Amino acid sequence: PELRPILLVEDNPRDLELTLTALEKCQLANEVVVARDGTEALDYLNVTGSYHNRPGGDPAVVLLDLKLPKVDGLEVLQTVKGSDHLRHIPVVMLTSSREEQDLVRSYELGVNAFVVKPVEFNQFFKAIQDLGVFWALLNE
Amino acid sequence: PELRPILLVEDNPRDLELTLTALEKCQLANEVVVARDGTEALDYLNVTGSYHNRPGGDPAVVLLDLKLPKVDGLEVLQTVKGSDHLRHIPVVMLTSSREEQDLVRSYELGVNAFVVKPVEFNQFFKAIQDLGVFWALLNE
Ligand SMILES: [Mg+2]
Ligand SMILES: [Mg+2]
């Protein structure tokens, strides 16, 4: 079967570069698609805006930075979680502090996967584990 | 592409069960094939003994318990590393103590991946990382 993309949603240019590098350097094979705000993220997930008739399919996981312009990360989260056609898509929240996580947990949106930036593979894989996502070793 | 099997080489019945359970519980998709001593391991890798004309292909990784009867783990390691047709296969050494690792490192066999038993996913994934093995998230 074909690998599905990772959706990385991130507004900070440096956080973007760091996370992309971390994912590459841990030899994750899935291609990463980048959204820079909540608008871009939801357009991707719903195959519209710039992404109309894009290579369809849901991402393997969404890495969702919490604070975004235009449409906030929490909004993206609420829309994925509250939508019938999206709620199955696994979401890892990216935050700058552990305390931002406490706030997110208070919203009771059933998020169990968090990574505190900078993203590194130990915390990333733990989030994968927290999500119950299946993973595989490749021979390539 | 088809996923390749994990080869787990383990003589202790309880260590076998624990490791199998850990691999299942971290949602690793690759099937696990079990060898119980160095003889069984090398037969598998060379597609002979019980494994003649088996579904061919090299494993994605070999998880190799260090002490085995008949043919010792170190022997299996030396044979994989010193053989032209096997040396590309990634090997994680399983040990009972960190000190067993120091001995293995003294043999200068280019092993960078170790897990101390009981196997758990954090140490397992770190070994995957130490080996430079590619990995993927599945949608299943
Ligand atoms: Mg942000
Ligand atoms: Mg043993």
- CB of B2 closer than 8 Å to CB of A136: no
**The pair of three-digit structure tokens given for residue B26, joined into one six-digit string:** 């971290």
- The answer to whether A10 and A94 are in contact (CB under 8 A) is yes
Report whether B29 contacts B63 (CB < 8 A). Answer: no
Q: How far apart are CA B58 and CA B80, in angstroms?
A: 12
User: Which of A6, A57, A136 lies at the smallest CB-CB distance from B135?
Assistant: A136
Angle, in degrees to the nearest 10, between helices B38-45 and B73-81:
20
Number of other CB atoms surrounding residue A90 within 10 Å: 21
The residues with which B94 forms a beta bridge, in sequence order, are B65, B115
| Site of tokens 């698609």 | A33
Q: State how far residue A26 is from chain B, nearest Cα, in angstroms.
A: 6
The encoded tokens of residue A24 equal 């590459």
Q: What is d(CA A31, CA A53) in angstroms, rounded to the nearest whole number?
A: 18
- Quick one: tokens of A33? 């698609």
Q: B29 and A136: CB-CB below 8 Å?
A: yes
Q: Which of A67, A58, A88 is nearest to A9 (CA)?
A: A67
Sign of CA dihedral B82, B88, B89, B93: positive
Query: Residue written as tokens 């960078």?
Result: B112
Chain B nearest-CA residue for A129: B26
Closest residue by Cα to residue B117 from B71, B67, B44: B67
- Supply the Cα-derived Rg of chain B in whole angstroms: 14
Please state, as a whole number, how many other Cβ atoms lie within 10 Å of the Cβ of residue B11.
17
Across the A/B interface, how many CB contacts are shorter than 8 Å? 92
Half-sphere exposure of B57 (CA within 13 A, CB side): 15
Determined by which method? X-ray
- Which of B137, B138, B140 would you mutate first to test chain A, the one with the most A CBs within 10 A? B137
Strands (E), chain B: 6-9, 32-35, 61-65, 91-95, 114-116, 135-137
Which residue type occupies A124?
F
Closest CA to A134 of B139, B127, B60, B61: B139
B63 to each of A52, A93, A118, B93, how far by Cα in Å? 45, 33, 31, 6
What's the gap in Å between the CA of A92 and the closest CA on chain B?
Answer: 13
Tally Cβ neighbours within 10 Å of residue B18: 16
- What is the domain class of A1-140 according to CATH? alpha beta
Helix (H, G, I), strand (E, B) or coil at A119: coil
The residues of B whose Cβ lies within 8 A of any Cβ of A are 1, 3-4, 6, 26-30, 57-58, 60-61, 121-122, 125-126, 128-129, 132-140
Resolution for this experimental structure (Å): 1.9
- Look up residue B2 and give its two tokens: 């088809």
DSSP summary character for residue B28: B
Compute the radius of gyration of chain A from its Cα atoms.
14
- What type of residue is B125? F
> Which three-class secondary structure state does DSSP give residue A41?
helix
* Phi (first) and psi of residue A95, to 5 degrees: -130, 165
**All residues at 6 or more sequence positions from B51 whose CB lies less than 8 Å from its CB, including other chains:** B43, B44
Report the C-alpha gap between B67 and B77 in whole angstroms: 11
